[PDB]
Amino acid sequence: VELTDGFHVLIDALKMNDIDTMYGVVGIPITNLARMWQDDGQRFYSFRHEQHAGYAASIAGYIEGKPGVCLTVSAPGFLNGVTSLAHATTNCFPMILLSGSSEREIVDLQQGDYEEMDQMNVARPHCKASFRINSIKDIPIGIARAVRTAVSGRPGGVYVDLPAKLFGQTISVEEANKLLFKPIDPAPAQIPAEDAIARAADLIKNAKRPVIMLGKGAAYAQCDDEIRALVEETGIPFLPMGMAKGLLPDNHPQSAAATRAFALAQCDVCVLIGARLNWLMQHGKGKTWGDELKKYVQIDIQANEMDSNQPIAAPVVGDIKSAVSLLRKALKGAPKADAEWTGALKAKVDGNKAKLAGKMTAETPSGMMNYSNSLGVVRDFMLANPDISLVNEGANALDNTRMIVDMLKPRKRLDSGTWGVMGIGMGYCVAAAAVTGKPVIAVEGDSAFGFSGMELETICRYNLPVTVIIMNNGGIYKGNEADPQPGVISCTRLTRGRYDMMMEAFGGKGYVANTPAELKAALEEAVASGKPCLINAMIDPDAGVES
Amino acid sequence: VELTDGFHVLIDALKMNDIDTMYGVVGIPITNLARMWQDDGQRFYSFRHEQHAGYAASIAGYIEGKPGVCLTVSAPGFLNGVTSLAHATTNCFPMILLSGSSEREIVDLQQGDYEEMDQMNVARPHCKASFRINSIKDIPIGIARAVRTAVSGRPGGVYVDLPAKLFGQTISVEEANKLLFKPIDPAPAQIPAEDAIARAADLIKNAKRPVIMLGKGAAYAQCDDEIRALVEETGIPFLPMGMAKGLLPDNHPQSAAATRAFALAQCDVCVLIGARLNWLMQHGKGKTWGDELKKYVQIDIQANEMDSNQPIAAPVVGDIKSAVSLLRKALKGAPKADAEWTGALKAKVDGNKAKLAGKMTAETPSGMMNYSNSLGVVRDFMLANPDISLVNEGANALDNTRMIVDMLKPRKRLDSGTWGVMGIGMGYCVAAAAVTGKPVIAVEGDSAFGFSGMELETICRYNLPVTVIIMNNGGIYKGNEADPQPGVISCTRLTRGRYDMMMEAFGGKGYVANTPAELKAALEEAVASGKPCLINAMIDPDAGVES
Amino acid sequence: VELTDGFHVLIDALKMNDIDTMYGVVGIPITNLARMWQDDGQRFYSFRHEQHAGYAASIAGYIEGKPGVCLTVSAPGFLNGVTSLAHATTNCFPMILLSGSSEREIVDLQQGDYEEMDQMNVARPHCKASFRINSIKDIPIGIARAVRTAVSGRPGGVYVDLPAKLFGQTISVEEANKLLFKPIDPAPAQIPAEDAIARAADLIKNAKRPVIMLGKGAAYAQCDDEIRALVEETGIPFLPMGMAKGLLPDNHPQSAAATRAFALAQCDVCVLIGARLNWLMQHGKGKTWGDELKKYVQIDIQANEMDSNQPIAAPVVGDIKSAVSLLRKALKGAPKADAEWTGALKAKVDGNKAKLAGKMTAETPSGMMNYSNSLGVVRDFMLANPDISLVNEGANALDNTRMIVDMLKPRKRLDSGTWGVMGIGMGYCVAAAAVTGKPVIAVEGDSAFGFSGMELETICRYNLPVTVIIMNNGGIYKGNEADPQPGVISCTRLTRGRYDMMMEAFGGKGYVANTPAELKAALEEAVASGKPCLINAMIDPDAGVES
Ligand SMILES: Nc1ncnc2c1ncn2[C@@H]1O[C@H](COP(=O)(O)OP(=O)(O)O)[C@@H](O)[C@H]1O
Ligand SMILES: Nc1ncnc2c1ncn2[C@@H]1O[C@H](COP(=O)(O)OP(=O)(O)O)[C@@H](O)[C@H]1O
Ligand SMILES: Nc1ncnc2c1ncn2[C@@H]1O[C@H](COP(=O)(O)OP(=O)(O)O)[C@@H](O)[C@H]1O
Ligand SMILES: Cc1ncc(Cc2csc(CCOP(=O)(O)OP(=O)(O)O)c2C)c(N)n1
Ligand SMILES: Cc1ncc(Cc2csc(CCOP(=O)(O)OP(=O)(O)O)c2C)c(N)n1
Ligand SMILES: Cc1ncc(Cc2csc(CCOP(=O)(O)OP(=O)(O)O)c2C)c(N)n1
Ligand SMILES: [Mg+2]
Ligand SMILES: [Mg+2]
Ligand SMILES: [Mg+2]
């Protein structure tokens, strides 16, 4: 009677759930899992820190709509990875953190085992569900639970604890076959009732100055044609959130993005589609919303997200595709949004875009570029070459890139997210490049970048087509804050370093861009090469604002 | 009537408790605390990731015996820091993590605040106590509690939550000066009963083959002369744990370190001074202890550490200085350890040191050094220059450096610790340099180094006298593992990179060392320069072992 | 080769740690543990709800100074018991909650096992340490850890999770003998340094108007002669906290209890001995302390209790016996406290006691007694018969009994404690009677009593010499609050019921007392009988105050 072991049953269970990639860092007790994963023909990305392996898993989950999988070791390794897990859960990104753990007997009596921690219990606040698979016969069920919990309802992070003793357990191949199974429909459709849709339809029809807010929940739903048909048929102005950019092209004629404050402040009805009324929307109150209570339509899969901040007139609970599909039929043949309202917002968009175009064309000293004329180059490149992932984080480097770099394609812009995390950059680059098989451009603030900068070597080792643009202004916000005391450097200062040399240290290609023309020629060559590159864009230290 | 604010009451409260240094990363809502700390004339070290600012804080606590203070932002920055607090708590290092947090009203209803998290609750498993100062009037009491919890009993990490709204509250200077106070005797002496000492004296006096195990709790106590006087007066051979190296000079004639296996297996009485019978001691059982229950004497400030793993025949609960002083007087004038026991171990030690000296002088090809002849250079240098901090982490780079590099001075060796953390290196380097005012050498595994390597820029930015030695063997354990499939790199491989170039990129000095002679010249020149350096030591990819 | 099993190894380990009593409620999976405990000759008290079995365990711990042991079942049973555990931890009472739990495999995958819960993790905030014993070979060590954690440092609650699969495991009797052991010195003495004692001695010597506050930490320490010698030699007025009553007799001439507010408000030095500066001491501020900062001496075993509320001038950290013993020698031959100060407080005590004596002698209608003339009877009885435990809880029934019923003997008064728990009554009665083997009187508020009233049957079933006096005023605070609406009873009303009938329902003796003479004759007969009794004392519904 032939046997298989815990390593292989786990490998098999994972593949049966359509996982072919893991991002992690090896060591006791999980190194042979990673090796056997690779021997079997599946792929494993080894990082330099588990946090970044974890941010990679998280964004692979957003892009693909199946859980990104992170593999770590016990205690300190697990902790690093659980920080990324927390991030996924907050952003609604499906992810599974697999971590090796130590001996139950010793850990439960707190005796001081190798890398001792109840990792299952410390994971709890940072994930939807935290499980432990103790027995080889329970791996198929455990992985099914983890995948279902990650992708169903509101997607998010799940932790699966893999005690060291799990892997060496044996069981007959005949029994293993009998236990291995594929979950039916792990991310089911959830459809709203007629009267929920009808209440929303009547709000929108009687709106005088409506608006549609698209969030990354809408972008994640992968129903781009449905969402676009709703916008185009209703005639309603729309606004995308940071990662909702590209769902409809950012230069779509119904986009009120360039006149956002005016549109939010002046609307009567606001349709939230896969967008929370959280801090990124000023909680639906204050000066951004005209100091009044709007009448909201909200489409979300989480029922208790409704009324979380402001009362919602028309709550529609269900998956966005189902809900939008039904709303479109309820609104069929109704009048389009008021020409006076839509034309007024278009006039503000054109006037604001002309104002921005002047900034981008302006001239600056060599090596002292500003955020406008530097990011104008990236904008032009991205309009001509839209099938490229855009990774973005920082302060001035984020806000200006979101404003300037138009996305024409959905789920391409990958940014700091709901928590404004600095640290997501290089991990996002590795994952985006692994799952798309297409180029990646990153626009990194120099402070932002240093949270994950050592992963430059990971990008080189896997020869990925990623181009990292460092907005090297020499600091957090600004690069010129005076010494507080004689001989003491200010806390916001960073070395205006040769990040291009760092990239070349690990086999990558380095550029220094002192002018827009130099940034353009470097970017065009980098992306064309298909090789790991870094462009050190030299930005005026005083160009940024703090706020 | 004149007023002060939360910022300054916190600065004054910290200063009153003898804090003059913080390690952190700035941003909302805590940047202006960092600035005013510097304005007032105290020092702030800005890092590239909060985890490494936290590892610095942790080892500053070990070295000085007063809490290392780390300052982070809310949610994601807090999470990064709290991973280091965990480490502090596990290693018994006094540390305070100060983090800004968001708005109470919004976080408590989970509405989606900027960087939303119950950071106070999330910290609880990773610290001794988790507090929050909500009001200006409680800052001095709050900081007093933090410093007492951190340094008293078993020392460890404390989290203090600093809601954004705390800093802008105002109070009169006269009221604030009445509230501000310095705690009396925050880490008190705790003296054991006479019969506790008598029970231990009895076991030692009747031992045939006694051994003293010194742990890093003994080193932390800073009573090096007392511990040395106990060892010399009794004539008992001793064994240092990883960071107890140098407490007594590693070349002391009574050291049994080079014959640890034999000494532990054959002893009858084992005297634990500030050392746990945890995984680093194989839990007081198995082959390493000759498959028998030794008679244990244990000195520890934590009462319930006794009988955690094995029954302790002579528990002595109290601070190590107090206990050792009493034990010495209790053993005064008694005969020394058996000369055939201490002679047997000395013969083993000399024979084992002879075998290692043979390896350290062996010859290897250019760019293909092994761990003996490369680290033999570091050994010779540290014998000549002992007033230098030795930071160390990795697998082969750790085990071989702990074995080969003799520490003649206490609290100089700073390594991975109880959790075997990869990531402590560059943070430890910064704190060590800061608190000692003297040179630091780091012997880093190349995998190890990648967990904090971006902090090279921090080391350069503060112009610290730190020399980083990368044991560049091309991977985890080894750098030569075959491609598991055509064109697919193995998971344990790293780029054999130019880490020297990376250092040069931020204004440091980079060296490549292909031979022991090149490593020696470069190490001597680097330490003597007083400047940030990195030596890329080229190790044979097949040199290291795995299991 | 002869075998033993998990049940017996646990029984043996428990007895070796000097436990002979358990309080609990049986059922799956722990009923045979309770039976075998009894078969072996040890005693088991079965309650009607685990909470009250738990309050019994907690107070057995206070009285004896070794952990009270509660035995419960999984999920809902455990939860009930953990509520008592939390109470023990808050009051610093040594206690161990043993709970059966379900199958690891099923619970860790949250599949819906019988009584599913991670009881080890939900215990965490309510105890000092929460452990789980998975393996038969680890029971001796697990029980040692639990006992050491309960009684060492600051005493408190420990949870030990006993998975169902533990009990049926086998091991050789030869190996069981080898693993069973008795912890050496689980509650060690901890002695303070000379200079800590000397700083306190100098504060007390230079005090103009000193005072000693004795708390239940001092009463728990069982060093009654030491504490009394300190008071009598220094000549310092003293004040006892609720359960510190009787440590010195309440009518001791140096007691300033009857003039408490004046003494706290007018002192310059305050010596806290085993007493926290918490809500029961108004946090050392406000009108009770003259709106000024006192200079404090505090003796406590928990080092970080110091400066928790107010700055402490003379912190003495150590066990009370050790600390008081040393302080007494430092103060030897020094002048006694000022006659003008001690005589002034005595004059207020006498005048206040005369004022109280008039209230107690006053006449009331039959069936409408007040708190003074009713509790005056209990007072007289307790002076004549002091070797009786006094259990007490309620609002008016607590405050008036603490004021009126003088305790002449230590650790006899057992009350609501730090949390002001209603619910501790009948459990306290069962435990007090089990551990003392002497009579118990309970003074219960009628609302208070109903939290544990069904345990009257437990008291009868074990034929315990307990007399429950219900202060039957017909409500919470007052028994006469008008109906808020027509036909609706007010929320503070209770049925003025025949609690004497309820007692007789289970074989006990019932009395109704309508007058002081009737209460006196019933109490004298009840206590003389040595049988379970209840006196239904009919109190005027309008006699109480709410505040
Ligand atoms: N397929 C889906 N159907 C419905 N709602 C979804 C779906 N996927 C995600 N969501 C919801 O979308 C929301 C995403 O909001 P958020 O992350 O704040 O986006 P943004 O920051 O772009 O506004 C979440 O509330 C989540 O529950
Ligand atoms: N001042 C002190 N006096 C006595 N014991 C101490 C003191 N400081 C720390 N300890 C104890 O020392 C121990 C440290 O042991 P550990 O971290 O395992 O060292 P190692 O890993 O070197 O064996 C802890 O159990 C801690 O309670
Ligand atoms: N043997 C002991 N030695 C020193 N301190 C003790 C001892 N036992 C208990 N304590 C301390 O006594 C205190 C009890 O305070 P508390 O329960 O508030 O008493 P009270 O309510 O009567 O003031 C706790 O802080 C506890 O740490
Ligand atoms: C994990 C974490 N730690 C700190 C912070 C706080 C922060 C917000 S923005 C920022 C850096 C801004 O500087 P950058 O150079 O990137 O951008 P620029 O203005 O163009 O110069 C930090 C540190 C966050 N958000 N997350
Ligand atoms: C936070 C964390 N993540 C992973 C790990 C697991 C590990 C233990 S040792 C090691 C690296 C070994 O390679 P290195 O190059 O440093 O040493 P060597 O080539 O043999 O000289 C890892 C990743 C740990 N301990 N902590
Ligand atoms: C577990 C719990 N739940 C509620 C409460 C709140 C409370 C405080 S006092 C009290 C009852 C007071 O009435 P009683 O009849 O006992 O006394 P008297 O004035 O003489 O009529 C309650 C319910 C507490 N403390 N604990
Ligand atoms: Mg910057
Ligand atoms: Mg290596
Ligand atoms: Mg009542």
From Swiss-Prot, chains A, B, C:
GO terms for biological process: fatty acid alpha-oxidation; oxalate catabolic process. ADP binds at residues 154, 216, 276, 300, 320. The N-terminus is blocked. Keywords: Decarboxylase, Lyase, Magnesium, Metal-binding, Nucleotide-binding, Thiamine pyrophosphate. Mg(2+) binds at residues 446, 473, 475. Substrate binds at residues 28, 114, 257-261, 352, 402-403. Pathway: Metabolic intermediate degradation; oxalate degradation; CO(2) and formate from oxalate: step 2/2. Changing residue 115 to Q: Slight increase of the affinity binding and strong reduction in the catalytic efficiency for oxalyl-CoA. Changing residue 114 to F: 2 and 12-fold reduction in the affinity binding and in the catalytic efficiency for oxalyl-CoA, respectively. Its EC number is 4.1.1.8. SUPFAM superfamilies: DHS-like NAD/FAD-binding domain (SSF52467), Thiamin diphosphate-binding fold (THDP-binding) (SSF52518). Thiamine diphosphate binds at residues 371, 395-397, 420-422, 447-448, 477. Changing residue 477 to F: 2-fold reduction in the affinity binding and strong reduction in the catalytic efficiency for oxalyl-CoA. It is an enzyme of class 4 (lyase). Binds 1 metal ion per subunit. Binds 1 thiamine pyrophosphate per subunit. It catalyses: oxalyl-CoA + H(+) = formyl-CoA + CO2. Homotetramer; dimer of dimers. Belongs to the TPP enzyme family. This is Oxalyl-CoA decarboxylase. It comes from Oxalobacter formigenes. The gene is oxc.
